[PDB]
Ligand binder design. Structure first.
Ligand SMILES: [Br-]
Ligand SMILES: [Br-]
Ligand SMILES: [Br-]
Ligand SMILES: [Br-]
Ligand SMILES: [Br-]
Ligand SMILES: [Br-]
Ligand SMILES: [Br-]
Ligand SMILES: [Br-]
Ligand SMILES: [Br-]
Ligand SMILES: [Br-]
Ligand SMILES: [Br-]
Ligand SMILES: [Br-]
Ligand SMILES: [Br-]
Ligand SMILES: [Br-]
Ligand SMILES: [Br-]
Ligand SMILES: [Br-]
Ligand SMILES: [Br-]
Length: 479
């Protein structure tokens, strides 16, 4: 009998639905459990993505209890569930408590703490805590198992709460992270990045079962509903799906909610930024003649590739673009191989610049910029709105005054700048001199478009670096 088959057996033997009947897992739930636990390579992370109301809470509770007192229970450990809100943490906790108190065989080996959200599986001394990003940071945190609940609600590419849990698991040799969530609405959101990385890499240590209706599928058809709702008829009401599908049809402002929540689709779109052929048509060398010069600086990727772009409109219609790049010296040989880009050759050829260490040293970047801006009277320099004072202080510290203007890295501020840049490329109004590094960034660039029509470049969607294009977008955007 397999490890996964034991979890299933445990859930179906000891877990009772709250009403009355013993829990019977659907094939999609079983197949997910089998894939996680009977992975011969070992599973580090497991993602199951399904539409709303397909039995998430029950499955989370079942798996927790298998680890609390069932066949996965191991001595003196902690297990956690993590959600964004108190409410969500209570829902999972309350369902687990009800399961514990509906079966005397579970009831008789679990102690519940009279404050907080904490269960102890007594036989193996397993502590279970229900956590949320809302409310107090708990002191003792070191989970061998963490189930993240509805992580698709995270809007950034990062979240402090998720990272705290992730970091805490790092104390153990081979911990398990399980994510059960409806997809994020946007391709740039944390869960979308996790799913995409798993799907593109086919990493043997990652399981990723995603149930979604295809993009072009008819929202009123049952086969579209089944594709996103694998529990259609058992846990998920088909009557309710039919009502929500009709509402989506009659209310266009509800369609995106229906698509995300009930068809498990992302509502954003993704495409390449530019073809090499179109890019190459703007590759005549740039000139430096007096004008309003605008700068865009992207230092964000401190371990990979930093970029400054100075650009400005000539007396003809055309924009001349001068890019400068910084990269860490220690990790140059490693990254050349990792990224499959000739960074070594470019540094040697004076087209890429280094900073000592594994990180990009701000001190060395501002020193070069001072030499660079000797040839440019800048009107503005666009920079991350959240890190502008820290860079302004470090620039001022070396005697270098820069006309810094705040520039958002999200969809609202990038949207118009991407549209402007695209429009200039399309009518041949750029001279970039086929700079190899910028060209690499252009060709790697992917653009995510949100539901409101705002476009931005995505470093996670792209294979290889794109940081020159972010700086070029900001540079254009600053006018
Ligand atoms: Br089975
Ligand atoms: Br819902
Ligand atoms: Br749900
Ligand atoms: Br066992
Ligand atoms: Br355990
Ligand atoms: Br509840
Ligand atoms: Br909580
Ligand atoms: Br916490
Ligand atoms: Br939820
Ligand atoms: Br990959
Ligand atoms: Br339902
Ligand atoms: Br798409
Ligand atoms: Br200046
Ligand atoms: Br200045
Ligand atoms: Br923004
Ligand atoms: Br334009
Ligand atoms: Br969106």
């Amino acid at each position: 009998m397999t490890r996964g088959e034991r979890v299933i057996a445990f859930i179906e033997r000891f877990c009772i639905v709250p009403i009355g009947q013993p829990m019977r897992l659907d094939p999609f739930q079983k197949d997910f459990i089998l894939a996680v636990y009977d992975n011969p390579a070992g599973t580090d992370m497991a993602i199951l993505s399904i539409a709303r109301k397909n039995g998430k809470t029950g499955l989370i509770a079942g798996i927790l209890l298998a680890h609390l007192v069932g066949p996965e229970a191991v001595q003196n450990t902690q297990i956690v569930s993590g959600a964004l809100s108190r409410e969500q943490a209570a829902i999972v906790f309350n369902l687990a408590v009800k399961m514990v108190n509906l079966n005397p065989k579970l009831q008789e080996i679990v102690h519940i703490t009279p404050s907080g959200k904490k269960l102890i599986g007594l036989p193996c001394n397993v502590e279970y805590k229900a956590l949320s990003a809302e409310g107090k940071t708990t002191h003792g945190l070191s989970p061998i198992l963490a189930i993240l609940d509805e992580t698709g609600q995270v809007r950034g590419p990062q979240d402090d709460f998720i990272d705290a849990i992730t970091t805490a698991q790092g104390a153990h040799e081979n911990p398990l992270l399980i994510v059960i969530s409806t997809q994020a609405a946007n391709d740039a959101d944390l869960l979308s990045i996790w799913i995409d990385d798993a799907v593109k890499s086919k990493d043997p240590h990652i399981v990723c079962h995603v149930y979604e209706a295809p993009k072009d599928a008819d929202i009123s058809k049952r086969e579209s509903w089944l594709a996103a709702n694998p529990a259609l008829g058992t846990f998920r009401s088909e009557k309710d799906m039919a009502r929500q599908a009709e509402k989506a049809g009659r209310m266009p402002s509800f369609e995106n909610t229906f698509r995300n929540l009930n068809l498990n689709q992302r509502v954003s779109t993704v495409s390449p930024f530019i073809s090499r052929s179109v890019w190459e048509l703007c590759g005549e060398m740039p000139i430096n003649t007096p004008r309003k010069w605008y700068a865009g600086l992207d230092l964000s990727a401190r371990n990979d590739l930093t970029a400054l772009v100075i650009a400005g409109e000539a007396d003809d219609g055309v924009w001349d673009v001068f890019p400068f790049f910084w990269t860490p010296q220690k990790t140059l040989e490693e990254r050349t191989k990792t990224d499959r880009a000739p960074y070594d050759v470019w540094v040697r050829e004076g087209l890429l610049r280094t900073t000592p260490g594994a990180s990009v040293d701000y001190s060395f970047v501002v020193a070069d910029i001072a030499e660079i801006i000797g040839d440019f009277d800048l009107t503005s320099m666009a920079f991350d709105r959240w890190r502008i004072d820290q860079f302004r202080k470090d620039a001022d510290a070396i005697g270098l005054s820069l006309p810094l203007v705040e520039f958002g890295q999200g969809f609202k501020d990038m949207g118009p700048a991407v549209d402007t840049l695209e429009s200039l490329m399309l009518n041949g109004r750029v001279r970039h001199g086929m700079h190899p590094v910028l060209t690499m960034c252009a060709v790697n660039a992917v653009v995510v478009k949100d539901a409101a029509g705002n476009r931005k470049l995505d470093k996670s969607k792209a294979t290889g670096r794109i940081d020159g294009m972010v700086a070029m977008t900001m540079s254009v955007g600053a006018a």
